Amino acid sequence: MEFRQLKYFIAVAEAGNMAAAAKRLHVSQPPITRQMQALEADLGVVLLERSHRGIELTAAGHAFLEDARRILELAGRSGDRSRAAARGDVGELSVAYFGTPIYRSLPLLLRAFLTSTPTATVSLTHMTKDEQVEGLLAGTIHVGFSRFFPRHPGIEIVNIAQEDLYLAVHRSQSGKFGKTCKLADLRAVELTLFPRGGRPSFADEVIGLFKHAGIEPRIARVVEDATAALALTMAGAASSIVPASVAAIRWPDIAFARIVGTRVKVPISCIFRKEKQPPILARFVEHVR
Amino acid sequence: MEFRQLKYFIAVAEAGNMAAAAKRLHVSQPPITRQMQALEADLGVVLLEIELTAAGHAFLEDARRILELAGRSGDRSRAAARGDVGELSVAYFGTPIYRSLPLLLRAFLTSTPTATVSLTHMTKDEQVEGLLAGTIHVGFSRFFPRHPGIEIVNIAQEDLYLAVHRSQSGKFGKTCKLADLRAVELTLFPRGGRPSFADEVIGLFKHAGIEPRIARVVEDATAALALTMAGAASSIVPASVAAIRWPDIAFARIVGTRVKVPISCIFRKEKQPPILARFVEHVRRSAKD
Amino acid sequence: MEFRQLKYFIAVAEAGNMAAAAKRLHVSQPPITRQMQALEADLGVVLLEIELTAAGHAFLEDARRILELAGRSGDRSRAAARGDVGELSVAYFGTPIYRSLPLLLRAFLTSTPTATVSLTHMTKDEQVEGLLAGTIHVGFSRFFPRHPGIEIVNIAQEDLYLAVHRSQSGKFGKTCKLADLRAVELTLFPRGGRPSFADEVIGLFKHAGIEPRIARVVEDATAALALTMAGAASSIVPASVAAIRWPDIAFARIVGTRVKVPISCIFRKEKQPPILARFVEHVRRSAKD
Amino acid sequence: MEFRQLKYFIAVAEAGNMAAAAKRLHVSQPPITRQMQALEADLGVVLLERSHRGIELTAAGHAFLEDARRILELAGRSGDRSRAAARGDVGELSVAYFGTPIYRSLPLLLRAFLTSTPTATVSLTHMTKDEQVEGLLAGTIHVGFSRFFPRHPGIEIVNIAQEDLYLAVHRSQSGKFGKTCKLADLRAVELTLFPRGGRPSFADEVIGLFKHAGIEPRIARVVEDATAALALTMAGAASSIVPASVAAIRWPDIAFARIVGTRVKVPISCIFRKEKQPPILARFVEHVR
């Protein structure tokens, strides 16, 4: 069987007449006739008959007509599926994340991406920054989001944005601070930071910001992540410092106060393997920039 | 595009190597290469880098289906020429294949002597796409999500059975209730096509007020049975599975008036070809009661 | 074995490299090496090949727990010396951490002023092992499989809510039934600790006579919420999650007298230390009613 | 803190007297005393007191006594866990399989393995022979089972056993053959073989066996696997040839007849990466041989 044979047969069949089929096909009589004899020979069946009315289909012809249509319909749609995949119009972007960008910044970036590529999908996985590097190099994830990525030569970092910092305290300690504050005002406050590890982290950044401001902080403890800190704060057992992403959410019993200062800010970045980027990733990277 | 291109692309995809593709095709390299170049120019996309691009992986699946449909279409025209019913393409997922599906197929073939049948394991999502595109005629499984152009027919219901290694047979007898199994570590199946058989089993336990002990969820009934036969597991299976006598496996029927699961089939409600129309009339009266 | 060996092994495991282990430890290579040789001779096993052997991967997990327990034990003796209650080590899985767990912890801390708390996310299996070994005092989740030396206490029950992107809020109002959600593509969570929250949601749909439409099962509530906030999903979450106002997410309370899920805690029934004994008496009367 | 300090403190505490502790410790008085002062100094608490009775513990001492016991208990058990993992007494053997060994031979081999290594576990995954090679080289699976593995230099093949072949027919065609038969007697029987592909398969083997016997078989079709063939046979639409593993199971409506001949046999083999075998695999390989 050949594709040309199929499109001709459908036209011959639908037009119900040879001259009318030629008009639709932009082609002369003799090529059409050649393609029908070749088609009937391959199948080993007669598909067409003549009469006063012109062209008629046998039982074999009628059965083949429906299939010929489903075949060109599927072929046409399969062509589109392949071009769509080259363009990055479709595909599943595998995203990894660590730390607080997952609370607001990352989702909004995903909203904007899905909105300009509505037939794409995303998956999400929590991963340490080290896991993200390994996974990126290996191709198990396309893009990773966190704050302070360790250095690697085969990976591009893109600082998407920066975020303010907010003191977080139990509802009952609200109004000891107001809605705005400075790092100087927190030297009597026992602070719970996160995460632990020591490799460049949000905790270490906050500690450095206190050192820049010439202030000794009281760090009561470093907990495993923001969830722990927020839950301790909600339970009345702690105060913390958190980026704007976290403060954008209304958590019952927690109040926030923005820490003022030009330098008191924290980045959001994302990493990807700059080499051999599949189209869904290239489309996302072009959105990140 | 051209059928030869598709057939050659599949061989290059599956051999993963130009010389093995030549071996499988009985043809030299430069012809394969000119056919691959031509497919790429016709599609306006690149499929090969030997490994596949995104566009390539996408097109591979479709190419198989196009060739598949083309072959069945030739067979169908021939069948129509001879006055025979031709071949019903059935897809299946889950355990109906063990007994209840064969029995229904037998009754269909008895009443329809010139018909044949082919069977393909497919996931439910693959099935839906197969029905809308015309590559399969009908799918069987247990639970199917509704879909606009598809009818889902609940044919019959099957009892459930506890499966255990022969060494543990005495422990529960030949009939048991869900509450008797509250301490049994269960290996359920399958994974992914949720809600699946595992989900229904777990739901039945819950309706009875029991949280099942789930050791693991394995990929299919085959894995679960092999593990039970190896002495490493216990499971719960439909009657279709328990109708078979497996060495080293003992079964206990689970009693409870609601402890049953459906055998269901699905098909495209519109543009039904003759053989599907015949099978549906048969399913219709197989379901009656 | 020796504590220094354990601490050094962990640093070699986590740095994946002898010079980074030296950097993290402020110590040169030959001391680290002699400590690793010695741990290997003492154990009568090889842990390093820098990557880990099977024996190494096994011991790594345990080494962390041994050091963890050792640190908490020093803190506990000190607390006992001063007449303070000391620190309750709590583990958690699932969504109680969002609201109901913090609230119960607050009431405990109010009545027990010299106490503190630490929070660690753990899977249910990790929790059980933690309770039997004495590394944690108590675990929280929703469903827990029975286990000989563990008591499971159902504290309270939480309502369920549909979660949708703000754009879709009008569609269901502020209250809805499960049957109203029969066409909603749901993103449930988590994966693996079956039976989990996903299983209960699916079971509730089934009890009501509806097969839920499940688009996907994601790793946790964080993923599901980020996807819903990005406009890519709808989900079902307990009241603890819905008590929080998340930007771009709207909630509808699911009505039905049986549509609720438990908050549960688990602890070792034997050899309870004083602080756990205090927490249990508190949980006991928090559950009363 | 040091481990020696812990074991001494427990003995001193349990014996309730210094001389009695020395007896238990196989050690003199002065070292014991040195280890207690060092231990009290590290913790920064007093654990012990003297009186007429001998040794007594403070509140700090009593709290530390329970922890010291849990610490040595956990350390001891962690040592065992590491040695067990070196020996391959524990671990999860990842097994892959293709074709019919999964029906009987593979499970019995797993029974025997689990029986001599009862704290080990197994997982099972269906994989093509090509997938198994890739997975083996990569370390994603430990061992693969099938029949006719393609050649690779970094992989060892071990023929575990051979299996007879059996004609399979619908119940109603039983007694056209009896319980034994020859290939010559099947030249009028339309045969359904499996699987398709063409790379060395069970189908190709059966075809070669007919050629060795100087007999033209009637091969009506090659289907995707044994499940398809068995289901077609059960439905009355086919006869097939299957190895002994399949014939060992009683499938309703299928009858079997053994094909006699010294050469009419099919192997079961398994493959593994001979390089860098983890202990659980080495333990299994030693069982396979």
Question: How many beta carbons lie within 10 A of that of residue B204, not counting itself?
Answer: 22
Question: By CA distance, what is B74's nearest residue in A?
Answer: A43
Measuring CA to CA, which residue among D222, D246, D235 is closest to residue D163? Answer: D246
Structure tokens at B77: 């025209």
Q: CA-based angle B87:B90:B94, to the nearest 5?
A: 160
Strand (E) or helix (H) holding D181: strand D180-181
**Distance separating alpha carbons of residues B241 and A129, to the nearest angstrom:** 47
Neighbours of B20 (CB within 10 A): 15
Chain B contact residues (CB < 8 Å to A): 1-3, 43-47, 53-59, 62-63, 65-66, 69-70, 72-74, 76-81, 83, 133-135, 271, 273-274
Strand partners, B141: B264
Residue A82 has its nearest CB partner, among B2, B55, B273, at B55
Question: Which uninterrupted H or E stretch holds A272?
Answer: strand A265-273
Do A173 and A186 form a contact (C-beta atoms < 8 A)? Answer: no
Tokens of C38: 């010695």
What stretch of H or E contains C284? helix C274-287
Give the Cα separation of C49 and C54 in Å (integer): 10
Of D171, D169, D164, the C-alpha closest to D263 is D164
* Residues 6+ away with beta carbon under 8 Å from B267: B131, B137, B138, B139, B150, B151, B153, B276, B279, B280
How many CB atoms neighbour CB C243 within 10 A? 18
Q: State the Cα–Cα distance between residues B157 and D68, nearest whole angstrom.
A: 59
Q: Which residues of chain C are at the A interface, by a Cβ-Cβ cutoff of 8 Å?
A: 24, 97-99, 101-103, 105-106, 109-110, 116-121, 218-220, 222-223, 226-227, 229-232, 243-248
DSSP-assigned beta bridge partners for residue B117: B88
Tokens standing for residue A154 = 């085969």
CA C254 to chain centre: 26
CA distance B116 to B137: 13
Residue of D nearest to B229 (CA): D107
For residues B84 and B114, the answer to whether their CB atoms sit within 8 Å is yes
Using alpha carbons, list the distances in angstroms from residue A266 to A100, A146, A151, B13, B63.
11, 11, 18, 47, 50
Is-contact D217 D191, C-beta < 8 A? yes
Which residues neighbour B193 within 8 Å (Cβ) at sequence distance 6 or greater? B93, B123, B124, B125, B141
DSSP state of C25: H
Strand B260-268 and strand B138-141: pairing?
antiparallel
Total CB pairs under 8 A between chain A and C: 91
Which chain C residues touch B if contact means CB-CB below 8 Å?
A: 143, 145-146, 183, 194-195, 199-200, 202-203, 206-207, 211-214, 217
* D188 secondary structure, DSSP code: T
Residue with tokens 């078979």: B244
Mode of pairing for the β-strands spanning A48-51 and A54-57: antiparallel
CA distance D271 to D149: 8
Q: What are phi and psi of D249, to 5 degrees?
A: -95, 135
For the record, the structure tokens of D77 come out as 């058990």
Measured between beta carbons, the chain C residues lying within 8 angstroms of A227 are 97, 119, 121
Closest to B287 measured CA to CA, from B262, B267, B259, B270: B262
CB C228 within 8 A of CB C187: yes
Tokens of B171: 């422990």
Question: Is the CB of residue C122 less than 8 Å from the CB of residue C130?
Answer: yes
Count CB-CB contacts under 10 A for residue A135.
19
> In 3D, which of C246, C233, C250, C248 has the Cα closest to residue C170?
C250
User: Do the Cβ atoms of D22 and D28 come closer than 8 Å?
Assistant: yes
A265-273 and A190-193 as β-strands: parallel, antiparallel, unpaired?
unpaired
Task: Phi first, then psi: give them for residue A139, nearest 5 degrees.
Answer: 90, 10
User: Rounded CA gap, A185 and D231, in Å?
Assistant: 77
CA quadruple D244, D245, D246, D248: dihedral positive or negative?
Answer: positive
Question: Which parts of A97-249 fold into alpha helices (H)?
Answer: 105-116, 129-138, 202-212, 226-234, 244-247
Counting as contact any 3 or more CB pairs under 8 A, the partners of C are: A, B, D
Candidates D3, D81, D279; nearest CB to C62: D81
Residue type, B58: A
Q: Show Cβ contacts of residue A198 under 8 Å, excluding neighbours closer than 6 positions.
A: A204, C24
Binding-site residues on chain A for chain C (CB distance < 8 A): 102, 104, 106-108, 110-111, 114-115, 121-126, 198, 223-225, 227-228, 231-232, 234-237, 248-253
Contact indicator for B160, B237 with CB cutoff of 8 Å = yes
How far, CA to CA in Å, does C60 sit from each of C7, C65, D30? 10, 9, 36
**A6 vs A14: CA distance, rounded Å:** 12
Residue A2 and residue A40: Cα distance in Å, rounded? 11
- Closest residue, chain C, to D83 (C-alpha): C45
Q: Across the interface, which of B43, B46, B80 has its CB nearest the CB of A59?
A: B80
Amino acid making up residue D143: V
All residues at 6 or more sequence positions from C272 whose CB lies less than 8 Å from its CB, including other chains: C280
Judging contacts by C-beta atoms under 8 Å, the chain C residues touching residue B143 are 211
Resolution (A): 2.2
Contacts of C73 in chain D (CB under 8 A): 1, 64, 67-68, 70-71
The verdict on whether omega for the bond into residue C195 sits within 30 degrees of 0, i.e. cis, is: yes
Nearest chain C residue to A226 by CA: give it.
C119
Residue B180 amino acid letter: D
The partner residues of A219 in beta bridges, in order of sequence, read A191
Residue C46 carries which side chain, given as an amino acid letter? V
User: Per the CB < 8 Å rule, is B244 touching D235?
Assistant: no
Which candidate from C72, C73, C78 shows the least CB-CB separation from D44? C78
Does a cis peptide bond (omega within 30 degrees of 0) precede residue B195? yes
Question: What single letter denotes the amino acid at residue C56?
Answer: G
Give the whole-angstrom CA distance, residue D278 versus residue D143: 11
Domains of chain A in start order, with CATH, are 7-87 (1.10.10.10), 88-161+268-289 (3.40.190.10), 162-267 (3.40.190.10)
- Residues A61, A40: Cα–Cα separation, whole Å: 10
Inter-chain CB proximity B231 and D108 less than 8 Å = no
Closest Cβ–Cβ partner in B119, B120, B231 for D232? B119
- Do the Cβ atoms of C232 and A126 come within 8 Å? no
How far is Cα of residue D117 from the mean position of the Cα atoms in its chain?
9
DSSP, collapsed to helix, strand or coil, labels residue C247 as coil
Query: Are A164 and A256 within 8 A, CB to CB?
Result: no
CB D155 within 8 A of CB D273: yes
Closest residue in D to B114 (Cα–Cα): D237
Taking CB atoms and an 8 Å cutoff, what residues of chain C touch A232?
102, 117, 119
Q: List chain C residues with CB under 8 Å of B260.
A: none
Closest CB to B2: pick one of A2, A59, A81: A2
A236, C119: Cβ pair inside 8 Å?
Answer: no
Which structure tokens are listed for C189?
A: 């969570």
Measured in residues, chain D has a length of: 289
Q: Which residues of C189-205 are buried (b: 16+ CB within 10 A; e: fewer)?
A: bbeebbbbbbbbbbbbb
Please tell me the distance from the alpha carbon of residue B77 to that of residue A59, in angstroms, as a whole number. Answer: 8
Question: Are C45 and D86 within 8 A, CB to CB?
Answer: yes
Q: In degrees, to the nearest 5, what angle opens at C-alpha C56 toward C-alphas C50 and C60?
A: 105
Q: What number of other Cβ atoms are within 10 A of residue C285's Cβ?
A: 10
Distance between CA atoms of residues B116 and B114, nearest Å:
7
Residues in A touching C246 (Cβ below 8 Å): 249
Q: How was this structure determined?
A: X-ray
CA distance B151 to A88: 33
Asked if A3's CB is within 8 angstroms of B1's CB, the reply is yes
Q: What residues of C are in contact with residue D79 (Cβ under 8 Å)? A: 1, 43
In this structure, are residues B46 and B9 in contact, taking their beta carbons and an 8 Å threshold? no
Chain C neighbors of B146, CB-CB under 8 A: 183
Q: What's the CA gap between D273 and D281, in Å, rounded?
A: 10
Q: Cα separations (Å) of B247 from D116, D147, D183?
A: 21, 22, 28
Contacts of B107 (CB under 8 A, 6+ apart): B282, B286
Asked if A200 and A99 count as a contact pair (C-beta separation under 8 A), the reply is no
Which among B183, B195, B202 has CB closest to C195?
Answer: B202
Residue D142, helix vs strand vs coil: coil
Convert D167-199 to b/e letters by CB count within 10 Å (16 or more is b). bbbbeeeeeebeeebebebbeebebbbbbeeee
Q: Name chain B contacts of C195, Cβ cutoff 8 Å.
A: 202, 206, 211-212, 214
**With an 8 Å Cβ cutoff, are D250 and B244 in contact?**
yes
Which residues share a beta bridge with D143? Answer: D95
Q: Cβ separation of B110 and D227 shorter than 8 Å?
A: no
Least CA distance to D76: which residue of chain C?
Answer: C1
Residue A24, H or E segment: helix A18-25
Sign of CA dihedral D168, D169, D171, D177: negative
Distance of alpha carbon C266 from alpha carbon A119, whole angstroms: 44
How much of chain C is helix, strand and coil, in % rounded to 5? Answer: 50, 25, 30
Q: How far apart are CA A39 and CA A37, in angstroms?
A: 5
Which residues, 6+ apart, have CB-to-CB distance to C240 below 8 Å?
A: C95, C96, C97, C98, C99, C100, C101, C158, C263
Chain C residues within an 8 Å CB radius of B207: 203, 206-207
Of C106, C222, C232, the CB nearest to A122: C232
Nearest to B242 by CA among D251, C8, C242, D49: D251
Give the minimum alpha-carbon distance from D107 to chain B in angstroms, rounded to a whole number: 5
Distance CA D248, CA D100 (A): 12
Q: How far is CA B17 from the centre of its chain?
A: 30
Query: Could you count the other beta carbons within 10 Å of the beta carbon of residue A204?
Result: 16
> What are the CA-CA distances from residue B251 to residues A164, A239, C203, D247 (Å)?
63, 59, 25, 20
Calpha distance B98→B238 (Å, rounded): 10
- Facing B119 at nearest CB: one of D124, D198, D228: D228
- Closest CA of chain D from C182, distance in Å: 34
State which H helix or E strand residue C193 sits in.
none
Long-range contacts, stretch C44-51, CB < 8 angstroms, 24+ apart? C44/D83, C45/D82, C45/D83, C45/D85, C45/D86, C46/D86, C47/C9, C47/D82, C48/C12, C50/C12, C50/C16, C50/C17, C50/C18, C51/C16
Scanning every residue of chain B, which has its alpha carbon at the shortest distance from the alpha carbon of D231?
Answer: B102
Q: Cα D102 vs. chain centroid, distance in angstroms?
A: 13
Tell me the two tokens of residue B204: 């039945």
Identity of the residue numbered D149: F
Residue D94's identity, in one-letter code, is: S
Give the tokens for residue A13.
């069949």
The one-letter code for the residue type at A67 is D
Per residue, the 3-state secondary structure of chain B, as one string, reads: CCHHHHHHHHHHHHHCCHHHHHHHHCCCHHHHHHHHHHHHHHHCCCCECCCECHHHHHHHHHHHHHHHHHHHHHHHHHHHHHCCCEEEEEEECCHHHHCHHHHHHHHHHHHCCCEEEEEEECCHHHHHHHHHHCCCCEEEECCCCCCCCEEEEEEEEEEEEEEEEHHHHHHCCCEECHHHHCCCCEEECCCCCCCCHHHHHHHHHHHCCCCCCEEEECCCHHHHHHHHHCCCCEEEEEHHHHCCECCCEEEEEECCCCCEEEEEEEEECCCCCHHHHHHHHHHHHHHCC
- For C81, the closest chain D residue by CA position comes to D60
CA distance D57 to B168: 52
User: Which of B101, B229, B232 is nearest residue D231 as measured by Cβ atoms?
Assistant: B101
Amino acid at C268: R
d(CA A173, CA A181): 14
- Interface touch A107/C230, C-beta < 8 Å: yes
Structure tokens at D289: 């041989």
The DSSP-derived string for D209-248 is HHHHTT---EEEEE-SSHHHHHHHHHTTS-EEEEEHHHHT
Sequential DSSP letters for D88-134: TSSEEEEEEE-SGGGGTHHHHHHHHHHHHSTTEEEEEEE--HHHHHH
What residue in B sits closest to A78 (Cα-Cα)?
B62
Sequence-separated (6 or more) residues with CB below 8 Å from residue C205: C178, C211, C212
